[PDB]
Amino acid sequence: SIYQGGNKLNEDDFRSHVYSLCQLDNVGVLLGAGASVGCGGKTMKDVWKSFKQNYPELLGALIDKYLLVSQIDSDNNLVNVELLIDEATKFLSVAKTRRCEDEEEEFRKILSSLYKEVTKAALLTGEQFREKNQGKKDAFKYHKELISKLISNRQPGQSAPAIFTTNYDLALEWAAEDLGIQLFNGFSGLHTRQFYPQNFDLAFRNVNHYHAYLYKLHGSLTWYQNDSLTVNEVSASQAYDEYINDIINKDDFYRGQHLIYPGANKYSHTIGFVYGEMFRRFGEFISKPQTALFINGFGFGDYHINRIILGALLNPSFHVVIYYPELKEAITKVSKGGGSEAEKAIVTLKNMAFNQVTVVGGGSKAYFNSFVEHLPYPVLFPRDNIVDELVEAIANLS
Amino acid sequence: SIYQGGNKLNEDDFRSHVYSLCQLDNVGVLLGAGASVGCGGKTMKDVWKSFKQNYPELLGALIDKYLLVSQIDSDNNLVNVELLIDEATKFLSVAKTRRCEDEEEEFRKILSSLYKEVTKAALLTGEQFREKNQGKKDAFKYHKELISKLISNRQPGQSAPAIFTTNYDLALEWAAEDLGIQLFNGFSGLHTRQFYPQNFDLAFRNVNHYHAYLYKLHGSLTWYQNDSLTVNEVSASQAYDEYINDIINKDDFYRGQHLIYPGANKYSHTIGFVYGEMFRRFGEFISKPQTALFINGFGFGDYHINRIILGALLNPSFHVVIYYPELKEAITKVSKGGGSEAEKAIVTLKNMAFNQVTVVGGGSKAYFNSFVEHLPYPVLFPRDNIVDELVEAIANLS
Amino acid sequence: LFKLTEISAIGYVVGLEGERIRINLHEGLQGRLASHRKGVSSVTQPGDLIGFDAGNILVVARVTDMAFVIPLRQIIAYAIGFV
Amino acid sequence: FKLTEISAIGYVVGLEGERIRINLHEGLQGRLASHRKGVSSVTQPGDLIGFDAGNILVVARVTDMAFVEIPLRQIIAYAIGFVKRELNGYVFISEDWRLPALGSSAVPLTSDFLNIIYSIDKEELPKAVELGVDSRTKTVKIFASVDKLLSRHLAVLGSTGYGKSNFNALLTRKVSEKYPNSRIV
Ligand SMILES: Nc1ncnc2c1ncn2[C@@H]1O[C@H](COP(=O)(O)OP(=O)(O)OC[C@H]2O[C@H](O)[C@H](O)[C@@H]2O)[C@@H](O)[C@H]1O
Ligand SMILES: Nc1ncnc2c1ncn2[C@@H]1O[C@H](COP(=O)(O)OP(=O)(O)OC[C@H]2O[C@H](O)[C@H](O)[C@@H]2O)[C@@H](O)[C@H]1O
Ligand SMILES: Nc1ncnc2c1ncn2[C@@H]1O[C@H](COP(=O)(O)OP(=O)(O)OP(O)(O)=S)[C@@H](O)[C@H]1O
């Protein structure tokens, strides 16, 4: 269940390939929504499989009246939830413009009910979302090891790792504030925090292994636009108090040009400028010599990311590694006239005369918590907890 | 006996650990009151006993009327005196200000009685305090070896040694004047001394010169304030006349806001400036890389030193050595859920798995004289007095 | 508060000529002595063992020479094995 | 206040295997020295010098001399042991794997350390016998123990006219003068 170059491999000859890959000039990682189900998250099926259940009286307008979703997809639970929100956001602006008072209050309900199932699921904890020191817990234990291993496996002079993701949750920031690591994300300031797209070109140094880079392709819960025209970041406690305790526990959606998740308001020239600058950097990191990319958690149901990856194998120095835990069923289904675009796409490159590609399956053998353990610790790295027995002796001195 | 890492240790490996610790970048010693018992001093229990044996009629007000002392601690002789004197200075300062003519007199004859008893113990020679060459005698013979061995075991280019202490006697200066070594203590001048806190950063060099640093944390018997803005230092013959004689002999004699021993008048803003710049420097010294500390005479009853020591132990390059004569008689009290905070603190250290800690507790084997014999002389050091046999003929010539 | 190791270094490699290894030391006693959670360790003279990081392995070597070029100091060593 | 009463003549500048390389100071500091016991020098490839190391003292023998190309002079040496304290004296141990550190200072040897390098134990001192004096310096007397020397067999070798019959009479008479209940044939 490990296919390189079209044919098979074994565990050791692949665990020895991983180690040689992590030692290249440029190293990166792409994550998805299936990586945060071991911490309190939910995939994209379970969201529609619950919207359907809780709001049936709205599921008829979308199909019989406005034609925004199809019946077989809704029954097989195969809908894209970002494009639906974008289209429903664009249907409301026209009505607000040309003064139609029915089609304006018919969409507020739809949008309020859609922005209420994805938020409740992106809170990995619950009412402890507003509190402090949340990366100290047990669910965020492998996220730490990922960063530790990605940083400690570099040499002096070699660049720093990169991280891309599609989630809009706070699981890698909580887990880095604890280690003592600093992540660049484009924003600067504390009392008025703003987006400057050149802070990705900076780095630290001492004057007497500190930092990394993070790219969020679909936004976050802490990003918003005010009565001004500028994007602002804030903390979780402040967001809970402004615009997150009303979404759930009320029925309010009148700020229709205000939120920046999950990829909704891309018709404004000020909010699309922040989405573009992330794909423009993905497609520029993925085009360098001596590059390696690990993928995990991602279902290949996006046309542009595939059209961007496929076009990078034309350079002989780019290598890929993929984890897909439902590979058997896909081969079966596309053996005899069937399957969806994702399965066809992955099977297309599973059969190739390309040693640059490597696919991994096996259900629980392709999950996040196994991806991590396949990565090496150095031999001179501190692991034994030899400082914790001593921080409570200072507390006993009450 | 000797425990390192929770495991027992033997003498010839201890004597080689000591010689490897005495060769690091930073080396220091912290002394206490027991270290001046062979020279003519005493501890705090012997002071409290004499107080309660000679002034039994003031031992009732302090307990039943103002609540400065407790009966259980008075009975078991566990009182802190340098902490009872500051409160009694505060009471008198408040009474003077609010014009209570009756309560101003009682706190004026409590302090005289306290100062007489705490001052008689720190002369070490009696009426020969106001004389010259008092370090030629025999009681100051082990204080010279300490300094000689701390200086001789350095190399060219290395820093110089540091000696912190809580005493306020004059036993480490008499011994260096009879040995030809310059101590830095933060004072300058002859006809008018005063505190400059930035000459702890100076040193000597030759052209065609051996020194050390001394930090007193509770004051000295020769420091005093007369004007509004400056503390002054003075010699022993000049102090005996002015103020140290009337204290002993006369019956009621007290000047307020005048003396700088022991930790008494910290409510001003010129005296606390002297007490703070010593703890700041202690902290700074105990936080550098490649640091070694020896402790002797200190009973571990100071919460503000306990945690400095505990928290300087998070750094891998800090080693400490402790001497405690009463370890056995205290390991039991806390197995039986008893004991005082000092006993608990020291057993917490004795029972941890750290190799940066070492405890020596064999009674008269954990005393000042044995400490000084555990340290090494070099082979080429000139160790005999060839010259005194030649200094007698020059006298005889007459 | 993130640290990549707990035992500190002694120098850096600047040359390989066949079997030989060439090392340049840091300035001060930081190039001779060390101190860690377990004790005190030194490297002083020919006939002593030294180690190098290589990621997943630690290379072991024996010293042969030492000399001057304050002035700068060098070392020569040969390889023994790895852990 | 003094750390030493014996001055230096050079410093170590190299360690190449079992060898030691030493650069000297300019002038008669490099050849002579005066101290409370007399005058000592280091002047040709047969002499002994020592190196200070704090706890021990390394002892070495000279082998070469030269100008590198006022000019600068070098020296080369080998090691034969070290000295240390026992209770209130010193003791000499012979083992050759130790070496001094870079920058350490070189110092000459005196008649107080030579008399420890060429001496016998304390256990054997009341059973000793005098034979002569050291040749190069002539400040140190040589003793040997009757037990070690005679409990086993002994050999005396030499050509004609060089002093071989004085030795046997010296020895046999000094054994009697000290142990008058002996037996000699
Ligand atoms: N514990 C686990 N560990 C690892 N992988 C898992 C786990 N559980 C499930 N999976 C895998 O995780 C996958 C879940 O796939 P989905 O969440 O639908 O897709 P997305 O996260 O890319 O959705 C975001 C996209 O939506 C828009 O279309 C945009 O294009 C975005 O790209 C499955 O293949 C599971 O096998
Ligand atoms: N001959 C001796 N040699 C060595 N140690 C001795 C000897 N005799 C007794 N001892 C030990 O000496 C110790 C005496 O302890 P104490 O005099 O009470 O404490 P301090 O001098 O630090 O008091 C000043 C502190 O008091 C406040 O708490 C402030 O924080 C001050 O820092 C005992 O453990 C004896 O075993
Ligand atoms: N320490 C000394 N210094 C100078 N001359 C010495 C010394 N010891 C002995 N001699 C002289 O050496 C000379 C000859 O020594 P001999 O006793 O003849 O040795 P030998 O000839 O080997 O002994 P044989 O085999 O019996 S002839 C004597 O005249 C001594 O004076």
Q: Is the shortest distance between the CB of D163 and ligand 3 below 6 Å?
A: yes
Q: Is the shortest distance between the CB of B161 and ligand 2 below 6 Å?
A: no
Q: How far apart are CA A186 and CA A214, in angstroms?
A: 9
Q: Which two tokens stand for residue A155?
A: 């040499």
- Which of C16, C20, C9, C15 minimizes the C-alpha distance to C52? C9
* A166 neighbors A31 (Cβ within 8 angstroms): yes
* Min Cα–Cα distance to chain D from C30, Å: 14
Q: Which two tokens stand for residue D57?
A: 């003292």
- Which of B30, B31, B32, B28 minimizes the C-alpha distance to B285? B28
Q: Is the shortest distance between the CB of A368 and ligand 1 below 6 Å?
A: yes
Q: What is the largest CA-CA distance in chain D?
A: 67
* C11 neighbors C3 (Cβ within 8 angstroms): no
Own/partner long-range contacts of A105-112 (Cβ < 8 Å, ≥24 apart): A106/A61, A108/A253, A108/A254, A109/A58, A110/A58, A110/A61, A110/A62, A111/A85, A111/A253, A111/A256, A112/A247, A112/A251, A112/A252, A112/A253
* Min Cα–Cα distance to chain A from B307, Å: 7
Count of A–B CB contacts within 8 Å?
20
Own/partner long-range contacts of A184-193 (Cβ < 8 Å, ≥24 apart): A184/A211, A184/A212, A184/A213, A184/A214, A185/A214, A185/A215, A185/A216, A186/A277, A187/A233, A192/A232, A193/A232, A193/A233, A193/A234
Q: How far apart are CA C13 and CA C51, in angstroms?
A: 12
Cα(A251) to centroid(ligand 2), Å? 71
- Which of A160, A186, A189 minimizes the C-alpha distance to A276? A186
Measured between CB atoms, which of B303, B310, B353 is closest to A393? B310
- Which of A108, A113, A130 minimizes the C-alpha distance to A222? A130
Q: For B346, which residue in chain A has the nearest alpha carbon?
A: A393
Query: Experimental method used, please?
Result: cryo-EM
Q: Which two tokens stand for residue C33?
A: 């002595």
Distances A211 to A174, A228, C8 between C-alpha atoms, Å = 15, 32, 21
* D81 neighbors D95 (Cβ within 8 angstroms): yes
- Other beta carbons within 10 Å of D84: 12
Distances A363 to A44, A146, A300, A323, A368 between C-alpha atoms, Å = 18, 21, 17, 10, 11
Q: How far apart are CA B324 and CA B4, in angstroms?
A: 14
Phi, psi of C42 (to 5 degrees): -135, 165
Q: What is the largest CA-CA distance in chain C?
A: 40
* Min Cα–Cα distance to chain A from C27, Å: 15
Partners of residue D79 on adjacent β-strands: D60
Give CA torsion, residues A99, A101, A103, A104, to 10 deg: 80
Pairing mode, if any, of strands B291-296 and B318-323? parallel
Cα(A38) to centroid(ligand 1), Å? 13
Pairing mode, if any, of strands A2-4 and A358-360? antiparallel
Q: How far apart are CA B349 and CA A181, in angstroms?
A: 32
Q: Tell me which of A43, A84, A275, A294 to substitute to probe ligand 1's pocket, judged by most ligand atoms within 8 Å of the beta carbon.
A: A43
In degrees, rounded to 5, the angle at the alpha carbon of residue B375 between the alpha carbons of residues B370 and B379 is: 130
Compute the Cα dihedral for A19, A306, A298, A183 and give only its sign: positive
After which residues does chain A show a gap where C to N exceeds 2.5 Å? 208
* C46 neighbors D15 (Cβ within 8 angstroms): yes
Q: How far apart are CA C76 and CA C48, in angstroms?
A: 11
CB half-sphere exposure, A223, CA atoms < 13 A:
24
Q: How far apart are CA C19 and CA A19, in angstroms?
A: 26
Cα(D159) to centroid(ligand 3), Å? 10
Q: What is the DSSP string of B259-314?
A: B--SS--TTSSSSHHHHHHHHHHHHHHTTSSSEEEEEES-----HHHHHHHHHTTS
* D12 neighbors D60 (Cβ within 8 angstroms): no
Phi, psi of C35 (to 5 degrees): -155, 135
Q: Do chains A and D touch (3 or more CB pairs under 8 A)?
A: no
Q: Which two tokens stand for residue D129?
A: 């016998």
* Min Cα–Cα distance to chain B from D144, Å: 27
Cα(D61) to centroid(ligand 2), Å? 53
Q: Which two tokens stand for residue B374?
A: 């555990």
Q: How far apart are CA B132 and CA B124, in angstroms?
A: 14
Q: Is the shortest distance between the CB of B51 and ligand 2 below 6 Å?
A: no
Q: Do D101 and C45 touch (CB under 8 A)?
A: yes
Per DSSP (E only), the strands in A15-166 are 26-30, 162-165
Q: Which two tokens stand for residue A138?
A: 């047990």
**Per-position b or e across B226-262, b if 16+ CB within 10 A of its CB:** eeeeebbbeebeebbeeebeebeeeeeeeeeeebbbb
Q: Is the shortest distance between the CB of A34 and ligand 1 below 6 Å?
A: yes
Chain A, residues 156-195, CB within 8 A of chain C, namely 179-181
* C31 neighbors C2 (Cβ within 8 angstroms): no
AA identity, residue C83: V
Interface test with C, best of A19, A375, A379 (most C CBs within 10 A): A379
Distances B107 to B100, B142, B252 between C-alpha atoms, Å = 12, 41, 11
Own/partner long-range contacts of D28-35 (Cβ < 8 Å, ≥24 apart): D30/D73, D33/D6, D33/D7, D33/D9, D33/D108, D35/D5, D35/D6, D35/D110
Q: Which two tokens stand for residue A237?
A: 């406690």
Bond before B262 cis per omega within 30 degrees: yes
Q: Do C67 and D99 touch (CB under 8 A)?
A: no
**Per-position b or e across A175-212, b if 16+ CB within 10 A of its CB:** bbbbeebeebebeeeeeebebeeeebeeeeeeeeeeeb
Cβ neighbours of A152 in C, within 8 Å: 4
Measured between CB atoms, which of B306, B313, B345 is closest to A390? B313
Q: How far apart are CA D141 and CA B208, in angstroms?
A: 41
Place of tokens 């909010």: A271
* B56 neighbors B49 (Cβ within 8 angstroms): no
Q: How far apart are CA B98 and CA B159, in angstroms?
A: 53
Pairing mode, if any, of strands B7-8 and B2-4? antiparallel
Residue nearest to atom 7 of ligand 3 (CA): D163
Interface test with A, best of C4, C12, C60 (most A CBs within 10 A): C4
Distances B237 to B174, B188, B241, B245, B262 between C-alpha atoms, Å = 13, 19, 7, 11, 21
A396 interfacial to chain B (CB closer than 8 Å): yes
* D6 neighbors D34 (Cβ within 8 angstroms): no
Give CA torsion, residues B96, B97, B100, B102, to 10 deg: -10
**Per-position b or e across B11-46, b if 16+ CB within 10 A of its CB:** eeebeebbebbbbbbbbbbbbbbbbbeebbbbbbee
Rg, Å, chain C Cα set: 13
Residues 6 or more apart in contact with residue A305 via CB below 8 angstroms: none
Q: Which ligand is nearest to the CA of B299?
A: 2
Partners of residue B213 on adjacent β-strands: B162, B184
Per DSSP (E only), the strands in chain A are 2-4, 7-8, 26-30, 162-165, 182-184, 187-188, 194-195, 211-216, 223-225, 231-233, 291-295, 318-323, 358-360
Q: Which two tokens stand for residue A188?
A: 């600067």
Give CA torsion, residues B116, B122, B125, B127, to 10 deg: -30
Residue nearest to atom 32 of ligand 1 (CA): A302
Distance of alpha carbon C55 from its chain centroid, rounded? Answer: 16
Q: For C33, which residue in chain B has the nearest alpha carbon?
A: B24
Indicate the DSSP class of residue A242. Answer: I
Cα(A253) to centroid(ligand 2), Å? 72
Q: What is the DSSP string of A258-285?
A: -B--SS--TTSTTTHHHHHHHHHHHHHH
Q: Which residues of B touch chain D, with CB atoms under 8 Å apart?
A: 19, 23, 152-153, 179-181, 210, 376-382, 386
Q: Is the shortest distance between the CB of B197 and ligand 2 below 6 Å?
A: no
Point out the ligand 3 atom lying closest to the alpha carbon of residue D159.
22
* D130 neighbors D138 (Cβ within 8 angstroms): no
Q: Do B386 and D36 touch (CB under 8 A)?
A: yes
Chains in contact with B, where contact means 3 or more Cβ–Cβ distances below 8 Å, are A, C, D
Cα(A16) to centroid(ligand 1), Å? 27
Distances A372 to A149, A179, A294, A319 between C-alpha atoms, Å = 9, 17, 11, 19
Compute the Cα dihedral for B255, B260, B263, B269 and give only its sign: positive
Measured between CB atoms, which of D1, D6, D36 is closest to B380? D6
* A288 neighbors A310 (Cβ within 8 angstroms): no
Per DSSP, the three-state class of D74 is strand
Place of tokens 């209570």: B100
Q: What is the largest CA-CA distance in chain A?
A: 73
Q: What is the DSSP string of B113-164?
A: HHHHHHHHTT-SSGGGGSSS--SSSSTTSHHHHHHHHHHHT--TT----EEE
Place of tokens 């000793």: D128
Measured between CB atoms, which of B23, B380, B386 is closest to D4? B380
- Other beta carbons within 10 Å of D153: 5
- Which of B100, B118, B121, B98 minimizes the C-alpha distance to B40? B121
- Which of C70, C20, C61, C55 minimizes the C-alpha distance to C43? C61
AA identity, residue B36: S
Residues 6 or more apart in contact with residue A14 via CB below 8 angstroms: A2, A4, A358
Q: How far apart are CA C73 and CA D104, in angstroms?
A: 15
CB half-sphere exposure, D161, CA atoms < 13 A:
0
Pairing mode, if any, of strands D128-133 and D141-145? antiparallel
Chain A, residues 1-60, CB within 8 A of chain C, namely 19, 23
Q: How far apart are CA A367 and CA A362, in angstroms?
A: 9
Q: Is the shortest distance between the CB of D168 and ligand 3 below 6 Å?
A: no
Cβ neighbours of B377 in D, within 8 Å: 85
Q: Is the shortest distance between the CB of D159 and ligand 3 below 6 Å?
A: no
Cβ neighbours of B311 in A, within 8 Å: 394
Measured between CB atoms, which of B310, B352, B354 is closest to A394? B310
Q: Is the shortest distance between the CB of D162 and ligand 3 below 6 Å?
A: yes
Cα(A67) to centroid(ligand 1), Å? 26
- Which of B220, B143, B230 minimizes the C-alpha distance to B185? B220
Rg, Å, chain B Cα set: 23
Give CA torsion, residues A188, A207, B199, B216, to 10 deg: 70
Interface test with D, best of B379, B381, B384, B390 (most D CBs within 10 A): B379
Cβ neighbours of B180 in D, within 8 Å: 1
* Angle between helices B303-311 and B272-285 in degrees, nearest 10: 30
Q: Which two tokens stand for residue A265?
A: 């308001």
Burial class (CB in 10 A: 0-12, 13-18, 19+), B290: buried
Q: How far apart are CA D83 and CA D56, in angstroms?
A: 6
Q: How far apart are CA A140 and CA A182, in angstroms?
A: 17
Point out the ligand 1 atom lying closest to the alpha carbon of residue A325.
36
Partners of residue A290 on adjacent β-strands: none
In degrees, rounded to 5, the angle at the alpha carbon of residue A357 between the alpha carbons of residues A351 and A361 is: 75
